[PDB]
Protein backbone atom coordinates (compact mmCIF):
# COMPACT_ATOMS: atom_id res chain seq x y z
CA UNK A 1 0.00 0.00 0.00
CA UNK A 2 1.30 3.51 -0.95
CA UNK A 3 0.53 6.52 1.25
CA UNK A 4 2.01 9.85 0.08
CA UNK A 5 5.87 9.27 0.03
CA UNK A 6 5.49 6.13 2.19
CA UNK A 7 5.29 2.48 1.08
CA UNK A 8 3.47 0.61 3.86
CA UNK A 9 4.89 -2.87 4.66
CA UNK A 10 4.21 -5.58 7.29
CA UNK A 11 2.86 -5.25 10.78
CA UNK A 12 5.78 -4.93 13.24
CA UNK A 13 4.00 -4.14 16.52
CA UNK A 14 1.06 -2.57 18.34
CA UNK A 15 0.31 0.53 20.42
CA UNK A 16 -2.18 0.53 23.33
CA UNK A 17 -4.50 1.26 20.34
CA UNK A 18 -3.63 0.82 16.68
CA UNK A 19 -1.16 -1.34 14.76
CA UNK A 20 2.41 -0.40 13.90
CA UNK A 21 3.64 -1.13 10.38
CA UNK A 22 7.00 -0.75 8.72
CA UNK A 23 6.97 2.23 6.31
CA UNK A 24 9.60 3.00 3.65
CA UNK A 25 10.03 6.75 2.95
CA UNK A 26 10.78 7.12 -0.80
CA UNK A 27 12.20 10.71 -0.38
CA UNK A 28 15.02 9.89 2.12
CA UNK A 29 15.20 6.03 1.54
CA UNK A 30 14.77 5.55 5.36
CA UNK A 31 12.38 3.24 7.16
CA UNK A 32 9.96 4.54 9.80
CA UNK A 33 7.44 3.03 12.16
CA UNK A 34 3.90 4.01 11.19
CA UNK A 35 1.07 3.60 13.73
CA UNK A 36 -2.22 3.05 11.79
CA UNK A 37 -5.44 3.85 13.67
CA UNK A 38 -9.10 3.54 12.69
CA UNK A 39 -11.21 6.40 14.05
CA UNK A 40 -14.30 4.13 13.91
CA UNK A 41 -12.55 1.38 15.92
CA UNK A 42 -11.29 3.94 18.53
CA UNK A 43 -14.83 5.32 18.93
CA UNK A 44 -16.29 1.79 19.41
CA UNK A 45 -13.52 0.94 21.93
CA UNK A 46 -14.92 3.72 24.24
CA UNK A 47 -10.82 10.31 28.13
CA UNK A 48 -11.72 7.61 25.55
CA UNK A 49 -9.30 6.01 23.08
CA UNK A 50 -9.75 8.62 20.32
CA UNK A 51 -9.19 11.47 22.83
CA UNK A 52 -6.05 9.60 24.05
CA UNK A 53 -4.65 9.50 20.49
CA UNK A 54 -5.20 13.24 19.90
CA UNK A 55 -3.65 14.07 23.34
CA UNK A 56 -0.55 12.08 22.37
CA UNK A 57 -0.35 13.90 19.00
CA UNK A 58 -0.58 17.28 20.80
CA UNK A 59 2.00 16.33 23.48
CA UNK A 60 4.53 14.72 21.08
CA UNK A 61 4.48 17.77 18.72
CA UNK A 62 5.82 19.94 21.65
CA UNK A 63 8.60 17.59 22.87
CA UNK A 64 12.26 17.17 21.89
CA UNK A 65 14.55 15.00 24.07
CA UNK A 66 16.84 12.02 23.44
CA UNK A 67 14.76 9.87 25.88
CA UNK A 68 11.32 10.64 24.31
CA UNK A 69 10.17 8.89 21.14
CA UNK A 70 10.16 11.23 18.06
CA UNK A 71 6.91 11.85 16.17
CA UNK A 72 8.01 12.80 12.64
CA UNK A 73 4.64 13.30 10.87
CA UNK A 74 0.87 12.89 11.28
CA UNK A 75 -1.29 12.12 8.22
CA UNK A 76 -4.91 12.87 9.14
CA UNK A 77 -7.62 13.78 6.62
CA UNK A 78 -10.81 14.76 8.63
CA UNK A 79 -13.10 12.95 6.08
CA UNK A 80 -11.11 9.63 6.26
CA UNK A 81 -11.45 6.91 8.90
CA UNK A 82 -7.71 6.27 9.18
CA UNK A 83 -5.02 8.47 10.71
CA UNK A 84 -1.30 7.71 10.50
CA UNK A 85 1.44 8.57 12.97
CA UNK A 86 5.04 8.30 11.71
CA UNK A 87 7.80 7.75 14.25
CA UNK A 88 11.56 7.35 14.04
CA UNK A 89 12.31 3.64 13.76
CA UNK A 90 13.56 2.05 17.01
CA UNK A 91 14.28 -1.55 18.14
CA UNK A 92 11.40 -3.98 17.54
CA UNK A 93 11.47 -5.05 21.16
CA UNK A 94 11.03 -2.64 24.12
CA UNK A 95 13.38 -2.38 27.17
CA UNK A 96 12.21 -5.83 28.28
CA UNK A 97 9.36 -8.30 27.92
CA UNK A 98 7.19 -8.82 31.04
CA UNK A 99 6.77 -11.61 32.52
CA UNK A 100 10.11 -13.12 31.66
CA UNK A 101 12.38 -15.77 33.00
CA UNK A 102 15.44 -13.68 31.80
CA UNK A 103 15.33 -10.31 33.59
CA UNK A 104 17.93 -7.60 33.25
CA UNK A 105 21.24 -7.77 35.09
CA UNK A 106 21.84 -5.08 37.66
CA UNK A 107 24.30 -3.11 35.40
CA UNK A 108 21.83 -3.10 32.49
CA UNK A 109 18.93 -2.18 34.78
CA UNK A 110 20.96 0.76 36.14
CA UNK A 111 21.84 1.98 32.64
CA UNK A 112 18.16 1.96 31.46
CA UNK A 113 16.92 3.32 34.80
CA UNK A 114 19.35 6.31 34.43
CA UNK A 115 17.77 7.02 31.00
CA UNK A 116 14.26 6.73 32.50
CA UNK A 117 15.24 9.27 35.22
CA UNK A 118 16.46 11.76 32.58
CA UNK A 119 13.35 11.32 30.46
CA UNK A 120 10.92 11.67 33.40
CA UNK A 121 12.83 14.69 34.77
CA UNK A 122 12.47 16.32 31.30
CA UNK A 123 8.74 15.53 31.15
CA UNK A 124 8.18 16.86 34.66
CA UNK A 125 10.29 19.94 33.77
CA UNK A 126 8.02 20.37 30.69
CA UNK A 127 4.97 20.16 33.05
CA UNK A 128 3.72 16.74 31.84
CA UNK A 129 2.80 13.72 34.02
CA UNK A 130 3.14 10.61 31.84
CA UNK A 131 0.79 8.30 33.78
CA UNK A 132 1.56 5.07 31.86
CA UNK A 133 5.20 4.33 32.63
CA UNK A 134 5.91 0.65 32.20
CA UNK A 135 8.48 -1.50 30.35
CA UNK A 136 6.35 -1.96 27.21
CA UNK A 137 6.19 1.92 26.86
CA UNK A 138 10.01 2.16 27.12
CA UNK A 139 11.37 1.74 23.61
CA UNK A 140 15.10 1.27 22.84
CA UNK A 141 16.65 3.40 20.06
CA UNK A 142 19.58 2.89 17.67
CA UNK A 143 21.86 4.59 20.31
CA UNK A 144 20.84 1.85 22.81
CA UNK A 145 19.08 4.46 24.96
CA UNK A 146 15.45 4.44 26.24
CA UNK A 147 12.74 6.38 24.36
CA UNK A 148 9.56 6.98 26.34
CA UNK A 149 6.33 6.37 24.43
CA UNK A 150 2.50 6.38 24.85
CA UNK A 151 1.33 9.82 26.03
CA UNK A 152 -2.40 8.97 25.74
CA UNK A 153 -3.29 9.29 29.43
CA UNK A 154 -0.76 12.05 30.24
CA UNK A 155 -1.71 15.22 32.09
CA UNK A 156 -0.21 18.73 31.63
CA UNK A 157 -0.20 21.16 34.45
CA UNK A 158 0.42 24.73 35.39
CA UNK A 159 2.49 25.40 38.45
CA UNK A 160 4.74 23.15 40.47
CA UNK A 161 2.79 19.73 40.20
CA UNK A 162 -0.44 18.20 38.93
CA UNK A 163 -3.05 17.76 41.68
CA UNK A 164 -5.23 15.00 40.38
CA UNK A 165 -8.26 12.94 41.35
CA UNK A 166 -8.83 10.45 38.45
CA UNK A 167 -7.63 6.88 38.05
CA UNK A 168 -6.06 6.16 34.62
CA UNK A 169 -3.22 3.96 33.35
CA UNK A 170 -2.22 0.31 33.50
CA UNK A 171 -3.71 -1.42 36.61
CA UNK A 172 -0.51 -3.22 37.69
CA UNK A 173 1.39 0.19 37.67
CA UNK A 174 -1.24 2.40 39.35
CA UNK A 175 -0.25 3.99 42.70
CA UNK A 176 -2.30 2.99 45.81
CA UNK A 177 -3.38 6.62 46.53
CA UNK A 178 -5.21 6.58 43.11
CA UNK A 179 -7.21 3.39 44.07
CA UNK A 180 -8.69 4.49 47.42
CA UNK A 181 -8.87 12.14 47.17
CA UNK A 182 -6.38 14.54 45.59
CA UNK A 183 -2.86 13.32 44.79
CA UNK A 184 0.45 14.44 43.33
CA UNK A 185 1.00 13.51 39.69
CA UNK A 186 4.78 13.39 40.02
CA UNK A 187 4.50 10.82 42.83
CA UNK A 188 2.27 8.63 40.59
CA UNK A 189 5.04 8.55 37.98
CA UNK A 190 7.62 7.75 40.70
CA UNK A 191 5.51 4.74 41.86
CA UNK A 192 5.25 3.45 38.24
CA UNK A 193 9.01 3.94 37.84
CA UNK A 194 9.35 1.73 40.98
CA UNK A 195 7.09 -1.03 39.59
CA UNK A 196 9.16 -0.76 36.35
CA UNK A 197 12.49 -1.10 38.15
CA UNK A 198 11.18 -4.07 40.10
CA UNK A 199 10.20 -5.59 36.72
CA UNK A 200 13.68 -4.93 35.28
CA UNK A 201 15.43 -7.15 37.86
CA UNK A 202 12.73 -9.75 38.79
CA UNK A 203 10.98 -10.18 35.43
CA UNK A 204 7.51 -9.88 37.01
CA UNK A 205 5.34 -7.24 38.65
CA UNK A 206 5.46 -6.91 42.47
CA UNK A 207 1.62 -6.97 42.69
CA UNK A 208 -0.25 -9.41 40.50
CA UNK A 209 -3.79 -10.83 40.25
CA UNK A 210 -6.06 -11.86 37.36
CA UNK A 211 -9.00 -10.26 39.21
CA UNK A 212 -8.71 -6.42 38.95
CA UNK A 213 -10.34 -5.94 42.49
CA UNK A 214 -7.79 -8.27 44.04
CA UNK A 215 -4.95 -6.57 42.13
CA UNK A 216 -6.07 -3.18 43.48
CA UNK A 217 -6.35 -4.50 47.07
CA UNK A 218 -2.82 -5.99 46.76
CA UNK A 219 -1.39 -2.68 45.51
CA UNK A 220 -3.03 -0.93 48.51
CA UNK A 221 -2.41 -3.56 51.21
CA UNK A 222 0.13 -6.24 50.25
CA UNK A 223 3.49 -5.52 51.85
CA UNK A 224 6.36 -5.43 49.39
CA UNK A 225 8.34 -8.71 49.48
CA UNK A 226 11.42 -9.53 47.40
CA UNK A 227 11.82 -13.01 45.87
CA UNK A 228 14.78 -15.11 47.06
CA UNK A 229 16.03 -15.30 43.41
CA UNK A 230 17.71 -13.56 41.70
CA UNK A 231 19.73 -12.16 44.55
CA UNK A 232 19.93 -8.38 44.13
CA UNK A 233 22.10 -5.86 45.99
CA UNK A 234 20.79 -4.32 49.20
CA UNK A 235 21.03 -0.74 47.88
CA UNK A 236 18.80 -1.67 44.90
CA UNK A 237 16.25 -3.25 47.31
CA UNK A 238 16.42 -0.06 49.39
CA UNK A 239 15.69 2.17 46.33
CA UNK A 240 12.77 0.01 45.18
CA UNK A 241 11.29 0.04 48.75
CA UNK A 242 11.42 3.86 48.79
CA UNK A 243 9.80 4.18 45.31
CA UNK A 244 7.10 1.65 46.31
CA UNK A 245 6.29 3.40 49.57
CA UNK A 246 2.47 3.20 49.63
CA UNK A 247 2.26 6.65 51.31
CA UNK A 248 2.98 9.30 48.58
CA UNK A 249 3.98 11.78 51.30
CA UNK A 250 7.05 9.72 52.28
CA UNK A 251 7.75 8.25 48.80
CA UNK A 252 11.14 9.21 47.40
CA UNK A 253 11.14 12.08 44.90
CA UNK A 254 13.12 12.29 41.65
CA UNK A 255 15.81 14.70 42.94
CA UNK A 256 16.45 12.20 45.78
CA UNK A 257 16.50 9.21 43.38
CA UNK A 258 19.35 10.98 41.54
CA UNK A 259 21.45 10.98 44.77
CA UNK A 260 20.55 7.41 45.79
CA UNK A 261 23.75 5.26 46.16
CA UNK A 262 22.54 2.53 43.71
CA UNK A 263 22.07 5.24 41.05
CA UNK A 264 25.34 7.16 41.73
CA UNK A 265 27.72 4.15 42.13
C1 LIG B 1 12.89 -5.79 11.75
C2 LIG B 1 12.36 -4.66 12.58
C3 LIG B 1 11.00 -4.51 12.82
C4 LIG B 1 10.51 -3.44 13.56
C5 LIG B 1 11.39 -2.51 14.10
N1 LIG B 1 10.97 -1.39 14.87
C6 LIG B 1 9.79 -1.15 15.51
N2 LIG B 1 8.97 -2.19 15.68
S1 LIG B 1 7.51 -2.01 16.44
N3 LIG B 1 7.30 -0.45 16.73
C7 LIG B 1 8.30 0.41 16.67
N4 LIG B 1 8.03 1.64 17.13
C8 LIG B 1 6.92 2.08 17.92
C9 LIG B 1 6.41 3.37 17.72
C10 LIG B 1 5.40 3.84 18.53
C11 LIG B 1 4.83 3.05 19.52
C12 LIG B 1 3.73 3.60 20.36
N5 LIG B 1 3.31 2.89 21.41
O1 LIG B 1 3.25 4.71 20.09
C13 LIG B 1 5.35 1.77 19.72
C14 LIG B 1 6.38 1.29 18.95
C15 LIG B 1 9.49 0.16 15.96
O2 LIG B 1 10.24 1.12 15.65
C16 LIG B 1 12.76 -2.65 13.87
C17 LIG B 1 13.23 -3.70 13.11
O3 LIG B 1 14.57 -3.79 12.88
MG1 LIG C 1 15.44 -7.06 24.79
Residue numbers in the entry: 160 to 205, 227 to 360, 364 to 448
Provide text from the study.
Protein kinases catalyze phosphate transfer from Adenosine Triphosphate (ATP) to tyrosine, threonine or serine residues in specific target proteins. CaMKK2 is predominantly expressed in the brain, with trace expression in peripheral tissues such as the testis, spleen and lung. In addition to recently being linked to appetite in vivo, CAMKK2 is over-expressed in multiple cancers. The knockout of CaMKK2 can reduce cell proliferation and tumorigenicity in vivo, making CAMKK2 an attractive drug target.
Diffracting crystals were obtained with compound 2 in complex with CAMKK2. The CAMKK2 kinase domain adopted an active state conformation in which residues of the regulatory and catalytic spines were aligned; residue Glu236 within α-C helix directly contacted Lys194 (“α-C helix in”); and residues Asp330 and Phe331 within the conserved DFG motif pointed towards and away, respectively, from the ATP-binding site (“DFG -in”). The ligand displayed two direct contact points to the hinge region of the ATP-binding pocket: one involving the oxygen atom of the thiadiazinone moiety and the other through the nitrogen atom of the hydroxymethylaniline moiety. A water bridge made by the nitrogen atom from the aminobenzamide provided a third contact point to the kinase hinge region. The co-crystal structure revealed that the oxygen atom of the aminobenzamide interacted with the catalytic Lys194 and made a water-bridge with Glu236 of the α-C helix and Asp330 within the conserved DFG motif. Likewise, two water-bridge interactions connected the nitrogen atom from the aminobenzamide moiety and residues Ser175 within P-loop and Asn317 at the bottom of the kinase ATP-binding site. Finally, the ligand aminobenzamide ring made a T-shaped π-π interaction with the Phe267. Compound 2 is bound to CAMKK2 with aniline groups in a twisted conformation relative to the central TDZ ring, as can be seen in the electron density map. We noted that STO-609 can displace a bound water molecule from the ATP-binding site that is still present when compound 2 is bound to the enzyme. We demonstrate, for the first time, that the 4H-1,2,6-thiadiazin-4-one (TDZ) chemotype can function as an ATP-competitive kinase inhibitor.
